[PDB]
Structure 1
Amino acid sequence: EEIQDVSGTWYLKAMTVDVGALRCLAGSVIPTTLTTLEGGNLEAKVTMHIKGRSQEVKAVLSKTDEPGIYTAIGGIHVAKIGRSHVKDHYIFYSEGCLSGVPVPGVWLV
């Protein structure tokens, strides 16, 4: 039993790290915590490693786009890695990654 319907297209509403110049946010993660918020928004905590040692980042994602501060990043496409058996291993990437040239980004491992 786990939170269902995480696969799909989501938009960042808030994130706890500075994504400054970033346009391409992507990765392959088992979230440290995933929470359904009152209204159907999702909050993800992922425990990563910024500019050195290891930190936990929270993001709140919504099915509705807010013309806002994350526009360069674009919609976040999320899919379960179905060949990782069952459960909670996801791949994601943002729309800003679709570019003929490299753009500033992060890959979460």
Structure 2
Amino acid sequence: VSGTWYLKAMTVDREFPEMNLESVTPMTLTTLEGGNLEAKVTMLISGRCQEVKAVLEKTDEPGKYTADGGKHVAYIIRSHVKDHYIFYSEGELHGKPVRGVKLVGRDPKNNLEALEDFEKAAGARGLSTESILIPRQSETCSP
């Protein structure tokens, strides 16, 4: 899964209306020695370019990862649709609990079959009434 991916869809959390995702850059996934994953992506949130970087540490359970010393737990399941993955995670952001589902794919273009799969995952996670944001794609970040 190493290489470039795109954040194609995501459930929006009601806990941080102060944080609005305006645009997102491509995502770079680099496979760490040991089975871990490094996800890098820059997000234009409320005017500022935030460079995000997460180190996903493997666990005894396939598809399950942790980060920030277990303070963040994530599940990465292959989508029924080729070149897509459904990402789910629970954690804390600024001391406030947060969880969401994200759709990532090799191609930035909208794929309705993948979106349907993503929507089914959001339903399974208990987030089906939350807003869904199909983010604007950008090659770079600039306010």
- TM-score, length of structure 2 as denominator length: 0.40
Higher-strand-fraction structure:
2
Higher-helix-fraction structure:
2
Whose RCO is larger (CA < 8 A, sep 6+)? Answer: 1
